[PDB]
Chain A
Amino acid sequence: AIFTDASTVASAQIHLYYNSNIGKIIMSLNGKKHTFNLYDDNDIRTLLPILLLSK
């Protein structure tokens, strides 16, 4: 369940590539790659709802 806005949510199918050597997660969503730094607070706060609302 990915929140595309503050009050809008959509069910989406995503792919995730984790590289723990450098600490980065690339999420392929809707055909586009978003890179999340695991040392960035805002990237963490954006990625964690996506990971935790997964099933």
Chain B
Amino acid sequence: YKTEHCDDFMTGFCRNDPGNPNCLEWLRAKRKPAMSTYSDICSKHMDARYCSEFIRIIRPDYFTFGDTALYVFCNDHKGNRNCWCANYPKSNSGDKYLGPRVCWLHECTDESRDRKWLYYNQDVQRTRCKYVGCTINVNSLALKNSQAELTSNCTRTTSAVG
């Protein structure tokens, strides 16, 4: 797929099966037919792995195809919990967390969250977020017949905790 000869056939062959390694390699060529075909594919199946690879491939040079796909998917799937950063469920405020405001909801700017769910303008501001507070992260906790407690009293003052 270094030349535009297989573009016409692969346009349909990859709608048939988008997760194909050959279709993904066709998309790595980063030509307009491939990116538009996958923008159409992912505007319906943005919750599939090949859409993660698609968003990885296009950004940052051709983020527009992924942004249009995300817009379509998250206006169709209003109830998907993964579209609540790009399309906030509040009726009059869907653009609540667009742009640098993505940092104002710390579950959107997360390392456990796939960045196909954020617009590119949200994704580029995810590295400028300024956070103050006391966060505890545990990668895993396998506890058997053992009670555990994870408390983070963030105040500098020594509270009157009873």
Is A33 a contact partner of B112 (Cβ separation < 8 A)?
A: yes
Within 8 A of A (CB), among B74-128: 111-114
Is A31 a contact partner of B112 (Cβ separation < 8 A)?
A: yes
- Listed residue (A31, A33, A34) with the most chain B CB atoms within 10 angstroms of its CB: A31
Residue B59 at the chain A interface, CB threshold 8 Å: no
- Main secondary structure, interface of A, reads strand
Given contact pairs A15-B140, A42-B19, A42-B21, A34 touches B49 in the complex (Cβ within 8 A): yes
- Main secondary structure, interface of B, reads loop
Is B20 a contact partner of A31 (Cβ separation < 8 A)?
A: no
Can you give 20 contacting A-B residue pairs, CB < 8 Å?
A15-B140, A28-B140, A31-B111, A31-B112, A31-B139, A32-B111, A32-B112, A32-B113, A32-B114, A33-B112, A34-B49, A35-B49, A40-B19, A42-B19, A42-B20, A42-B21, A42-B49, A42-B50, A43-B19, A43-B49
- Quote the shortest CB–CB distance from B135 to chain A (angstroms): 13
Q: Which residues of B contact A34 (CB under 8 A)?
A: 49
Q: Which residues of A contact B50 (CB under 8 A)?
A: 42
- Listed residue (A15, A34, A42, A43) with the most chain B CB atoms within 10 angstroms of its CB: A42
- A30 nearest in chain B by CB position: B111
- Quote the shortest CB–CB distance from A18 to chain B (angstroms): 16
- A15 nearest in chain B by CB position: B140
A15→B140 CA distance, assembly (Å): 9
Q: Which residues of A contact B139 (CB under 8 A)?
A: 31
- Quote the shortest CB–CB distance from B156 to chain A (angstroms): 29
- Quote the shortest CB–CB distance from A33 to chain B (angstroms): 7
Extra contacts besides A15-B140, A31-B112 (5): CB < 8 Å: A32-B111, A32-B112, A42-B20, A42-B21, A42-B50
